[PDB]
Amino acid sequence: SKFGAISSVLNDILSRLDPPEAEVQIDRLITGRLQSLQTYVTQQLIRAAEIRASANLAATKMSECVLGQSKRVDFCGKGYHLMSFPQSAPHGVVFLHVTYVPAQEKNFTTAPAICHDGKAHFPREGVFVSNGTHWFVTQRNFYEPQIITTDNTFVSGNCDVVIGIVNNTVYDPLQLE
Amino acid sequence: LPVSMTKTSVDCTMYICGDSTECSNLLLQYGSFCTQLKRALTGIAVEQDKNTQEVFAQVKQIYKTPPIKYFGGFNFSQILPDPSKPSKRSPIEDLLFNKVTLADAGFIKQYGDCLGDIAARDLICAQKFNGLTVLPPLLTDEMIAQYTSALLAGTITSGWTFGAGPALQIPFPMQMAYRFNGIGVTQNVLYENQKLIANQFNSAIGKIQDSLFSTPSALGKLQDVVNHNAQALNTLVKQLSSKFGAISSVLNDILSRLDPPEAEVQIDRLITGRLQSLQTYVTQQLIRAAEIRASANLAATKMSECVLGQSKRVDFCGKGYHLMSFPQSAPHGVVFLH
Amino acid sequence: LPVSMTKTSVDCTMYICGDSTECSNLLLQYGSFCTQLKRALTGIAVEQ
Amino acid sequence: VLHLTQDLFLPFFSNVTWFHAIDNPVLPFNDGVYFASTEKSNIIRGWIFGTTLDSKTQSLLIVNNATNVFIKVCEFQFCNDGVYSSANNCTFEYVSQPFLMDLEGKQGNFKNLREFVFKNIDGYFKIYSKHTPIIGRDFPQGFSALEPLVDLPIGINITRFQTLLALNRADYYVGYLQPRTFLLKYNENGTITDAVDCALDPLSETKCTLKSFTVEKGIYQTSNFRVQPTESIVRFPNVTNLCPFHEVFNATRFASVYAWNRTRISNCVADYSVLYNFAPFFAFKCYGVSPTKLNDLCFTNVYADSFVIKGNEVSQIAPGQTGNIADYNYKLPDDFTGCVIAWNSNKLDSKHSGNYDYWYRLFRKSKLKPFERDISTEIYQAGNKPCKGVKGPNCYFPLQSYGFRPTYGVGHQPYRVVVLSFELLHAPATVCGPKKSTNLVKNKCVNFNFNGLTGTGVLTKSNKKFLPFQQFGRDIVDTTDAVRDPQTLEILDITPCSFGGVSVITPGTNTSNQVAVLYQGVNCTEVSVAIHADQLTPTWRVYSTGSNVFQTRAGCLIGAEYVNNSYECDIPIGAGICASYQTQSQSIIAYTMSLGAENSVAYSNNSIAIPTNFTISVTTEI
Amino acid sequence: VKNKCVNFNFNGLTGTGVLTKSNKKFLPFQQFGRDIVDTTDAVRDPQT
Amino acid sequence: VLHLTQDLFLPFFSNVTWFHAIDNPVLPFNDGVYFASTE
Ligand SMILES: *[C@@H]1O[C@H](CO)[C@@H](O[C@@H]2O[C@H](CO)[C@@H](O)[C@H](O)[C@@H]2O)[C@H](O)[C@H]1NC(C)=O
Ligand SMILES: *[C@@H]1O[C@H](CO)[C@@H](O[C@@H]2O[C@H](CO)[C@@H](O)[C@H](O)[C@@H]2O)[C@H](O)[C@H]1NC(C)=O
Ligand SMILES: *[C@@H]1O[C@H](CO)[C@@H](O[C@@H]2O[C@H](CO)[C@@H](O)[C@H](O)[C@@H]2O)[C@H](O)[C@H]1NC(C)=O
Ligand SMILES: *[C@@H]1O[C@H](CO)[C@@H](O[C@@H]2O[C@H](CO)[C@@H](O)[C@H](O)[C@@H]2O)[C@H](O)[C@H]1NC(C)=O
Ligand SMILES: *[C@@H]1O[C@H](CO)[C@@H](O[C@@H]2O[C@H](CO)[C@@H](O)[C@H](O)[C@@H]2O)[C@H](O)[C@H]1NC(C)=O
Ligand SMILES: *[C@@H]1O[C@H](CO)[C@@H](O[C@@H]2O[C@H](CO)[C@@H](O)[C@H](O)[C@@H]2O)[C@H](O)[C@H]1NC(C)=O
Ligand SMILES: *[C@@H]1O[C@H](CO)[C@@H](O)[C@H](O)[C@H]1NC(C)=O
Ligand SMILES: *[C@@H]1O[C@H](CO)[C@@H](O)[C@H](O)[C@H]1NC(C)=O
Ligand SMILES: *[C@@H]1O[C@H](CO)[C@@H](O)[C@H](O)[C@H]1NC(C)=O
Ligand SMILES: *[C@@H]1O[C@H](CO)[C@@H](O)[C@H](O)[C@H]1NC(C)=O
Ligand SMILES: *[C@@H]1O[C@H](CO)[C@@H](O)[C@H](O)[C@H]1NC(C)=O
Ligand SMILES: *[C@@H]1O[C@H](CO)[C@@H](O)[C@H](O)[C@H]1NC(C)=O
Ligand SMILES: *[C@@H]1O[C@H](CO)[C@@H](O)[C@H](O)[C@H]1NC(C)=O
Ligand SMILES: *[C@@H]1O[C@H](CO)[C@@H](O)[C@H](O)[C@H]1NC(C)=O
Ligand SMILES: *[C@@H]1O[C@H](CO)[C@@H](O)[C@H](O)[C@H]1NC(C)=O
Ligand SMILES: *[C@@H]1O[C@H](CO)[C@@H](O)[C@H](O)[C@H]1NC(C)=O
Ligand SMILES: *[C@@H]1O[C@H](CO)[C@@H](O)[C@H](O)[C@H]1NC(C)=O
Ligand SMILES: *[C@@H]1O[C@H](CO)[C@@H](O)[C@H](O)[C@H]1NC(C)=O
């Protein structure tokens, strides 16, 4: 680009005029090319900052998903994270998130607590679920019904403060033995 | 949290050489100095659209709240959409829109009333006079509220399951019991103090609206972003009235006053001034867009963690042991209710 | 981890035109080129 | 390479006029001429160029022969059919290899079609030719590059053009070139395979601005659209009184430079043709304004300074000069907005026996600041004496004599100099040029010339509260908003012409060539009335059938019909509208983007959904 | 002299570099060469 | 608008000299003069 100078070639402009006059054209070309180079450098700096941020994110994702299990939702892929595998790519990294995603679900029934005899029972770790006629306990993320038993549930309450409580019986392995 | 900023599409040719063929020919001697500027601004606009998409479009299926609203005693009328209002926005979402004043809407098609401005034409007509236009966002402020409503109605009827796989319904008292169990307190506490915790929740939700009402500016970050963009644009416009060492600051004046062979020097001075001003504007906009992108990434992470589940990281989702979060849309930003 | 750096408040007039009225008048012809710089430096200091 | 050039080219899909021969119209020559013909062996000989084609302006001839050509630049008279009858003041003959090469494969079916392009950019007559075997049964659509043959500098004026014939006992294809931007694709061997215009179709413009020949699916911002003004209005003030310029230049006693006469010019119509009249000019060096472009400006005040000085002192008088007059008698300011005048006056400032009525100062205590008068007779001090009284040694009179006689040299002849001062600043102008006052038209993009304020826009009535002394309007950003009409004393707002921006929405060219056009941020009833009046800067004319118009919130889309269905966003347009290429049998449709599948959950007091199965999904992240 | 860093002055086109034989397909009217970014790449020998 | 100007103005809360008539002293003129009178 001429940048307002007579010619755009330093070699041509140098042999075409004497230095006292060619100094003006050389100054114009210098003040153009220096500004172009500064624009390039500033753009490279901003892009390098963005790439550094992305690389920090990639490193965090590696240290969390790959080197362990991450509990943060939608961080290591969509779903319930299990593990990850890295793959190298040109000027980047590729992750293979392995996620656990639920499937076919069924309406059953639920109750916050179950009252055997004046005491409210709650699941230790799980949901109180009902086929429709017999109450059971099971996990939250997979349907594995179990017979209600004093080891699946902990007792604390008075059967009068819980809202939505449901009547049934809870079994204990100790009276039988 | 800011999520995006105003999208500008500066015209190098019109801004630097208003409808002057001689000035255009002189500007062509600088090479592609303004093609870079147009590309950078286009990238900034696309990045803003991507930021909004990342922050809000987190769920693929738009859920709807149940026709009745009895969430075990919890009151959500303040955050749920109001059917009576034409905009279909929450009462808490209305205050955010009424407390933020945008200098340039952009989606106005204001041409046609600059002639009819009657009084002295305002900032927007002044910017239109020198080729300084602003593009409208891809996602309107109405459908963003729809995304927010879907996301908030997914976290009160299905817990955190709709953020992982299929949405599985579960009563809100049981969801609250599970969130309680996640922080180390057993569920019997909630099942015994359900009424008291419902009263506390209602009181907090009620008094947050008045706290946003009576404060001068609690949304200072969004207003800060808007003011910064408007002031950068105003400073860009104000550089058109500087001579930059030329005979006059008006291209139409120096063109009609001097012959081209002598006017070329003044035109070159004006070129080297306005190009530098435009490059400074573009660089500052790039920096501000990078900062906004970082903030939008933080907002997207906060959404995905606090809203779509329970977060164990202390002081991330508010002060104290985190339970849940409700999103609210604000002009060029998002509002969280931890 | 770094938390902050030095806070600077560059002065346009004294840096470019040391106590020279003619240079100040010449600089005034550039418009508000450097008021942007002063605002940027103040914003950096406040941010830090 | 995909090099892009801007030069004189024949527009794609342009008007080409086909003739027949069995008299020889003279086709105008302007910006070059494209010539194409198809003949069996030979029916066309040569061409004639020049203006008026007579013996008064240099002409040109390119007549071919059996083995050579006869290019020359001459002063032909006529032939009216041996093709000339005059070669008086004629040079620059030239003979070389013939431009016509014809081959046949033992049959006349190979009717080679010959294409020629001539142009006269900065003289340097250029001729390009290319002979293709594509028979000419129909003007072929395949690409055939044109290679130069000769390049010779006629350096003459050409406006008219003719064509010779031959003898015997379907041709003449003529096209005209225009300045267009072309994108040319070069083969690996250096030939030209395909080229695309950049001012023909919206897809062509996107293909030009994203230089390539494959345009991927998406929306591309190419250029901006501007409503070109229709009528130019000039409204000069309500005065028709001519200046006393004649009195200024017809004085009899232009004073000396030491005491320069100073007059003022106001309440004028200033035409400088009368100034040119009474002046055998010698020096019209004008600095602030261009003398040619001087009758189209308005000055708030004009000052006419007059004095008589010597030949070298004319070159002395200029912004930032030096000398006895430029320092002690008349110093023009460095930022002088004005210009001087000088012509010989050897008949009024000269007489027999001599004349010394004039004076000048060489002895001043210091320099003279611009536009300062130092008329005073004080003896210049030398050494340290308080010298008073008579003049002599060490005691010098300040002003000496410009003794003028009718017999001097040119450098010493009594030149007459009158310098003019103008103030071209934002002010109520009182002195204006002789430009007429046209009518006023509102609500239409017009070039206005209100009292020297040149610009463009739409003007209309306003309800401002202009105070009596007010003349202009402005805004916090210092741009002219309203101008009071000098001949009507009313208030008119100024508007941008139509400034916007055109974005072209297209699928991939490997899929289809259909495109849609978006005019950003404009109520596009404005463009519809503008596009009918043919005052839009974009020349790429997209169709408007009524079914393809949709006023979006971001402008309006032309070329795509709106469907009320909802789909996933394919090409983001803006304000919740996305366009995509869908089957009908194919077209471009705009629709409101769907956020997702409308789903309703079944929340209840005691209903819970528990998954009885699960799946393992592996995703990827870049 | 080929394959050696020399200063060349081909028909007034001043510069420096290493020149050698090539297999370009220069058309008869071609004189210079260039690349995608407009730098002189090949030249035709005026006496060869 | 809040336009800002730099020009010759009478300073706020400045020294202004009040005269009386019932001789007519000459006042220096420099950079302009502000004149106010009631009658
Ligand atoms: C309640 O849940 C029971 C699971 O134990 C189901 O009862 C089953 O009934 C069969 C006979 O019908 C028994 O043989 C079996 O051992 C089991 O008890 C029952 O289907 C389910 N009720 C409903 C309505 O699904
Ligand atoms: C669960 O079963 C309890 C008895 O084992 C019920 O208590 C009874 O309540 C009735 C009134 O509802 C009394 O009249 C009676 O004396 C006894 O206290 C209890 O209501 C029941 N709850 C549910 C939800 O079925
Ligand atoms: C949930 O909280 C709402 C507060 O926004 C209650 O609405 C109130 O309705 C009364 C009139 O009944 C208004 O005077 C008041 O300003 C407010 O709008 C709403 O009743 C409440 N609902 C439940 C079930 O708690
Ligand atoms: C560029 O020019 C080359 C030499 O002239 C071409 O190579 C030739 O290819 C032909 C077959 O087309 C062979 O018969 C011959 O021996 C030689 O290899 C080459 O094709 C050409 N490239 C183009 C025109 O794109
Ligand atoms: C400069 O000379 C002009 C023409 O000779 C003068 O203009 C005229 O002057 C006569 C008196 O000589 C007036 O009667 C007439 O109206 C017109 O103004 C001009 O005055 C003179 N100026 C000076 C400062 O000498
Ligand atoms: C849970 O879902 C699995 C797939 O998502 C089921 O596995 C299937 O098994 C059938 C054979 O019964 C295969 O044909 C099929 O390709 C797939 O592997 C699995 O049966 C299912 N389990 C339950 C209890 O529904
Ligand atoms: C639960 O019942 C509701 C009531 O109709 C139904 O809409 C929903 O699909 C059911 N959920 C299932 C079958 O998983
Ligand atoms: C060529 O001329 C015909 C006849 O006037 C006209 O109909 C046609 O539009 C012209 N072509 C173009 C591209 O305008
Ligand atoms: C044709 O014209 C050329 C032009 O110089 C001339 O030399 C030649 O003698 C003419 N006749 C033939 C048969 O070529
Ligand atoms: C050639 O031009 C000159 C120009 O004055 C003229 O005098 C002369 O007669 C011309 N020769 C002719 C007409 O043969
Ligand atoms: C060429 O002739 C035309 C026709 O009169 C005229 O308008 C034009 O000014 C001429 N050009 C020159 C350079 O004489
Ligand atoms: C001055 O005016 C008179 C009017 O009769 C005219 O004859 C004369 O030529 C004029 N002189 C000049 C120098 O304009
Ligand atoms: C302009 O001048 C004409 C004729 O002198 C007069 O009729 C008209 O009223 C004038 N206009 C104004 C605004 O003074
Ligand atoms: C812009 O929109 C339409 C289309 O032109 C029309 O009502 C008018 O021109 C404008 N209306 C408003 C409210 O700006
Ligand atoms: C179909 O589209 C038209 C506009 O083209 C709209 O007026 C109408 O309401 C739409 N119909 C439905 C059912 O949405
Ligand atoms: C839940 O119970 C409340 C009162 O007990 C009742 O108003 C509401 O309709 C019930 N909702 C469902 C879905 O059963
Ligand atoms: C250059 O000139 C010489 C002598 O005239 C000749 O031998 C040689 O072939 C010429 N070279 C070319 C490339 O024409
Ligand atoms: C005005 O003059 C009085 C009397 O000299 C003086 O006391 C006062 O300070 C002056 N005002 C100002 C602003 O200096």
Residue numbers in the entry:
A (entry chain A): 968 to 1144
B (entry chain C): 727 to 1064
C (entry chain B): 727 to 774
D (entry chain A): 47 to 68, 80 to 138, 158 to 210, 212 to 246, 263 to 677, 689 to 726
E (entry chain B): 534 to 581
F (entry chain C): 47 to 68, 80 to 96
What does the paper say about this structure?
The dense glycan shield consisting of 22–23 N-glycosylation sequons per protomer is an essential feature of SARS-CoV-2 S architecture. The glycans have been shown to play intrinsic and extrinsic roles in protein folding, modulating conformational activation and immune evasion. The transition to the ‘up’ state exposures of RBD for the binding to hACE2 is also a prerequisite for S-mediated viral fusion, directly correlating with infectivity. Here, we dissected the role of N354-linked glycosylation, acquired by BA.2.86 sub-lineages, as a RBD conformational control element in attenuating viral infectivity.
To further verify the role of N354 glycosylation in modulating RBD up/down disposition, four additional modified constructs, BA.2.86-T356K, predicted to remove glycosylation at N354, XBB.1.5-K356T and BA.2.75-K356T, predicted to acquire N354 glycan, together with BA.2.86-ins483V as a control, were characterized, and their structural features were compared with the ancestral strain. We observed that N354 glycosylation dramatically increased the proportion of the ‘closed’ form from 19% to 79% in BA.2.86, 50% to 75% in BA.2.75, and 45% to 90% in XBB.1.5, making the ‘closed’ form the dominant population. However, the insertion of V483 had little effect on the modulation of the RBD conformation, suggesting the ‘closed’ and ‘open’ form transition was not due to the general effects of mutations in RBD but the specific presence of N354 glycosylation.
